[PDB]
Symmetry: D2
Subunit: 422 residues, 4 copies
């Protein structure tokens, strides 16, 4: 029964053609949904009660579109998101962190506009986790956004939106200085021929996967759901193909901001992403990512590849990793393990931000500390196991890979352990 | 010899990549497509696309197959649509650069326990009106195909039966259906109501993969550019869907309400043409050819053996075309199954085979009507030169190019066994 | 170039020109061959063990010390000739030469003692002389038995029974020397600790032109099973009388290593020849060149694809450790082992990094020479009060001994493999450590 | 049949990995194909008798090597006459006649910087006596090859120059030497004294790999069966060395003292024949063909394009043979470079080309002696039928086998462009 589920016959295929031939509509997905969902907050999704339903449906990142609405409007949206998120904090083993992303208005006819400087300052003051920087055309645009965030915004992730020909042509220099990328297909589809957008999307996703940096696919993914309860056949195909392409996140704009079915749009992206993740041909994907990732003398990078290899060898249900900044979890995610990456962190901001990385499930640790550091580490690993059992990731008898470091503080991950559950 | 400009076009840097990941990383929006569009476009005929003048614009835009939906309209209405298609097609007979065959496909209303009475009558209408293809609705098992075949009667055994897979049973019994069918249509409209909407992409990719393995045509259909029924431009999901159906391996892509009743039928055809050309250049031929070769069983059939040798030879020299002489279309179909980048120019005396080979990706039919030469070898050479001169006129070939030529050792269908390398003079 | 660019700037272009590294980075086996370079010098310690047959040319204590220095790892006693008294004196001379280097535990070289049986002769199974010779082996503490003319699984069960309850730790290496042994190979390998491709008799029992097929098949199946395989007989035959071997002989040694042999053997070359020390030096020089020429990119990929999924934590840790070692160009993998098993499971994935096996068992230290790339370090300190401290001291002993021997250098990365509790069978941890 | 797929290591040939290919090698799986690696035997006192030479031709000797380091011109002229007399004693049965090449191995430069005066005289003797090949000793750079070519004069333009790599400089300047040479010899005797003995296998494997990539013949030489100079059977290292030279990709294997002066010249040839047949069946063609195709550059030469198409077609149908008509041997050499499992039966009228194609693995030369037919197409057909009749008599072909036939569009060398699938009747 285990080997009939989650497209495992198609996963064992010797060629990509045979993998396609073995895909089975009756093979049910079992793993938790790996690709994060970004939902744009607006009149249709602003209330606390509506936001609770969207969190339950699968929303991981709330997007604030600063092209419309005042600072007062956006501050109320942020407060409503935080109220809905904290309503589930009473059960720490099941609590789900939700990131808040600020999407800038952009440069308009201008570099960094004066409104963007004020909006970025608002973001830092309100503790946003991510900035989706509009119309990034070159590396100096990213440096300007970074400078506008100041010393208090050092920890905010900058995701550069590629929306025109120049952004595509200067992609490598933009990715180098960015934390990640958004394929902003709306403007991209007007700036370059509509029939070429799929080439830009596939190229950018491939380069972000190679760099190990998050990539978001955005705009018109389930467009018809703004007025209709069910999407078109092209829309479900688009969501599935963005996941198969290698996107870390998928996005909803008008579908959740102003449409009549915001919760249903989130549920639809969740249902498609789960099916598409099981249909990923891991045999070729892992081989290619492993071959292309450069040789490294960084112990976190070395431990990450060893852990992902070990996970595939034993069909590990999960890789439990301790992380301060999210970096150790991101380096595991870049190798696209089938095993869920359960990231145990004390940082509420890192817990929200790791939603940008495919297959990272953040757990915010709030248990009393242990006097002995080695005992504190072990208690965090047991917390990952207990949350994993409650959420359906793990069962007694499963094997897990545990990734830790040799001393406290960020940057010292160097250990991988094989553990039997219970 | 060819220049650096040649190797920058048609996604050639991405084509030379050693891995699929590197192939994706090398895709370039500035690398322009050069080859002729190989995925056929099926447009549904209706009130928005029935007039002779509108049909001429749709042929110019790229329509290769006209679909008649027998779920609506009388026999008289469909006979007038067929006459209008034929009138629009024959209006280009004066210019060899513009004349193109257009297939006519009858899409049945569907089943009741067996073949419905209306389907028996509609299939008989198809034979009487000389249709080329039947898109058989709601095929659930091999006996449904046998019933459609029997209803094509004494005169219509040459009509191609494309089975529409629209429900759970058709998906589960796919192998037995494909075995007795000429091809398959992934009919996503009903399929998306019969099975969970989130599973349709799995059924589409599986059916396309199995048809590619079997060397039989597969059509991707329904809601590909849906928003274009009322809007002049499609959504980002719609252009992505068309490109991904071509990258999946679909031989044909289809338009339904977009051309039958929408406000922009010509624009919908133009959009499918533009996307398909871009997506065909983005196909990773290096892995695709290797996998089709490895999966295809060994064969002692000379047509099959010649086809793989010709496709291998075409890749070796960057051949502009493979010119094949065919009476039934079979030798061209066996070349098409290996997905050459070279266009397959199929020269035939059969008007029906010329229309039907539009079902096979990358087959460009040329209908030959000259009186037959007394010496067979001279008649073969005249048809090969007709393919070369048509290719020159249409932009496929230039003097100095290399072409692969596929013929047989004697007249009649079934004897293809020869592959030649010719320098265009 | 992007996959090695940062490491090339850090370690230098000279590092990536040595040990056939340009040929190692090739995308195809054909390109790997085209890039093999006679100017690319080997750097790694020799990983294929050398078995030398003891005889009149190599029996003295002084001669044995030179053979240990030249690279002999396993001493073979051929029980087809010589009395029990003769073989007991050979064993005592080997042990005296081995213990003459015990003064420095960090450098000392364990040497295994292997008993090669006379065989069944015209009989159907275990002969009476073999029963007596196997009892002599147990009484004299031999580490390995090379069982002659093994034809079926019941032959190895008979050898096992003759070793008695006190010889349970002795490794049984089945010699495949005839058609039946080749045809029943799978059942023989299943119950054996390893195999010897005994080409002398095999080349008379089957057509001489088919021996290479049997050798390549048996080496491939042993590599797939993760069990040691020895290539034997006439590898450097002309060196019995000449100081230099023929072109076919150097080729044969290199190809046995490239095929995947864990051990290579010398018979008359060391037992009776005029150049026993030179024959050992020649096998050492060829094996180091051939080990660097192994196409690890395809070999590692194929060993992972063919090896079934495992729920054994030692097996899971071993593949993770070998993958980590390749990622950082690790100098060594340091492993703690009681029986040798954790080191054997690392060895089956054929890492380029040396596997430094730290053990308290003198017998396991001798026996791990059967596994390619395992360098045994015998730890003699009494146990620390706290088990975690005792584990740490053994890891540090491997590091310090490694540095003092040129295996490790300051700045190198090392992979360390340990377990969660004392006793054999609990290896489950892999650590990345920087050498300071 | 199942018996067919159990022979010639076919279970090991179908393996998905090289490791699984090794695990499936079977000592009971008998070789079926004809031996494709040529055997060069050095002529000396043990192999000069016309009667002894007839036995060596029957045992499998394809090339007779004359070592000009020993013996006078008078001695070598008698060797040549004895070889020719033994070879021509079988000319009375044209369907079984085996051509045998004559190769002149030069003394070398000695302590000098380039072409010695004795080599100039020996090379002139070679041209005057019609030798087919020159094995040029101690080639260190491209100018050494040009000097050998100049010494052959205007009448020796058709002689093949095989450069012997015997020292460090030859290995380091390998690429420039291969570029101007017809092929290479890995001369392990001197190479093993000029560089450390333990590094010779690296130079051998590298040079064989680069020659396979370039599509040029490579010879493995010296001490392959050394102990057979005095003993009836070789050592285990010697049989392994022969098998590994074939597995490495050598086109030819050589015997020196084993045939020139030893007591078992015929047995040494029989032993190389037996080992080479076993080793050729153990070649992992799945990976080898894939890598040769991937590495071989794109080509606009029709002979090269036809060759890859023909080899691909041969693998698809398990063709018993590829029958090629050739004037210079070039069309057969281009087929050989893709290492088909099918035997390349090369039909030629050139006695010299028939002798020289023995340098290319898997090429079986057939010398055609009939004068040209009046109709060129009939002359082509008669030569193809001669290849079939020779193949049937020699055991290469049987009724029911498929063969690939490679011809050109006009008489004269350089116009091969046709591949055809033929059933043996
Ligand atoms: O491992 S992957 O999932 N590769 C998917 C993939 C797609 C197309 C083809 C080429 C082909 C196209 C269509 C075919 O039907 C067919 O047989 C072959 C081969 C492989 C992967 C994904 C993302 C990044 C790296 C790697
Ligand atoms: O297709 S071939 O015959 N390749 C042979 C080959 C040998 C070793 C390995 C590396 C390895 C892998 C697995 C092993 O078991 C093992 O002993 C060594 C991989 C491939 C071929 C020959 C020549 C040129 C191109 C191609
Ligand atoms: O992923 P990051 O940010 O590098 O954090 C990993 C760090 O987490 C740990 O596992 C635990 O550290 P803390 O006890 O400081 O939380 C460290 O050993 C390791 O360096
Ligand atoms: O593709 P099909 O229908 O098998 O037809 C291929 C046939 O066409 C030819 O090339 C030409 O045949 P005709 O002269 O009869 O048209 C034959 O030699 C070959 O058998
Ligand atoms: O390779 P083996 O024989 O399984 O030994 C590995 C064992 O060695 C250890 O690392 C140390 O164990 P000891 O303290 O008993 O020597 C164990 O944790 C582990 O189980
Ligand atoms: O291999 P080569 O030397 O190019 O010879 C191939 C030539 O042989 C032929 O098949 C037959 O030519 P001939 O009739 O002159 O012998 C030509 O058509 C072709 O060009
Ligand atoms: O800004 C965006 O999100 C877009 O243009 O798609
Ligand atoms: O009939 C169709 O085309 C469908 O249901 O998609
Ligand atoms: O016994 C042996 O070692 C042999 O036969 O090779
Ligand atoms: O000259 C030769 O043949 C050699 O040195 O091997
Ligand atoms: K915005
Ligand atoms: K219909
Ligand atoms: K013995
Ligand atoms: K000479
Ligand atoms: Mg935008
Ligand atoms: Mg329908
Ligand atoms: Mg023996
Ligand atoms: Mg020499």
């Amino acid at each position: 029964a285990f080997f009939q589920q989650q497209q495992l016959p198609a996963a064992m295929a010797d060629t990509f053609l045979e993998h396609l031939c073995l895909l089975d509509i009756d093979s049910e997905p079992v793993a938790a949904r790996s690709t994060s969902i970004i939902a744009t907050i607006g009149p249709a999704s602003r209330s606390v009660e509506r936001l609770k339903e969207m969190i339950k449906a699968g929303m991981n990142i709330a997007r604030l579109n600063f092209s419309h609405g005042s600072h007062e409007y956006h501050a109320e949206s942020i407060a409503n998101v935080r109220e809905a998120v904290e309503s589930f904090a009473g059960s720490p083993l099941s609590y789900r962190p939700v990131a808040i992303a600020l999407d800038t208005k952009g440069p308009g006819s201008g570099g960094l506009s004066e409104q963007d400087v004020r909006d970025l300052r608002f973001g830092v003051e309100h503790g946003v986790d991510i900035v989706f920087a509009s119309f990034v055309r070159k590396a100096s645009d990213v440096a300007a956004v970074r400078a506008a965030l100041g010393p208090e915004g050092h920890g905010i992730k900058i995701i550069s939106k590629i929306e025109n020909h120049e952004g595509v042509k200067r992609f490598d220099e933009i990715l180098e200085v960015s934390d990640g990328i958004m394929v902003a297909r709306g403007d991209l589809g007007i700036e370059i021929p509509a029939e070429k957008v799929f080439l830009a999307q596939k190229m950018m996703i491939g380069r972000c996967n190679l760099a190990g940096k998050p990539v978001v696919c955005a705009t018109q993914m389930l467009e018809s759901m703004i007025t209709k309860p069910r999407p078109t056949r092209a829309e479900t195909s688009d969501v599935a193909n963005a996941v198969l392409d290698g996107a870390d996140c998928i996005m909803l704009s008008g579908e959740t901001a102003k449409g009549n079915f915001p919760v249903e749009a989130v549920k639809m992206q969740h249902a498609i992403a789960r099916e598409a993740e099981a249909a990923v041909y891991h045999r070729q994907l892992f081989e290619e990512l492993r071959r292309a990732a450069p040789l490294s003398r960084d112990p976190t990078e070395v431990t990450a590849i060893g852990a992902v290899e070990a996970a595939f060898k034993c069909c590990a249900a999960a890789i439990i990793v301790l992380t301060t900044t999210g970096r150790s979890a991101q380096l595991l995610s870049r190798y696209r393990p089938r095993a869920a990456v359960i990231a145990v962190t004390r940082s509420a901001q890192a817990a929200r931000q790791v939603h940008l990385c495919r297959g990272v499930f953040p757990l915010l640790y709030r248990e009393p500390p242990e006097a002995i550091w080695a005992d504190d580490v072990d208690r965090r690993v047991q917390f990952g196991i207990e949350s994993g059992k409650l959420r359906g990731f793990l069962r007694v008898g499963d094997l897990v890979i545990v990734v830790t470091g040799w001393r406290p503080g960020s940057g010292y991950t160097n250990i991988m352990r094989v553990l039997s559950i219970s």
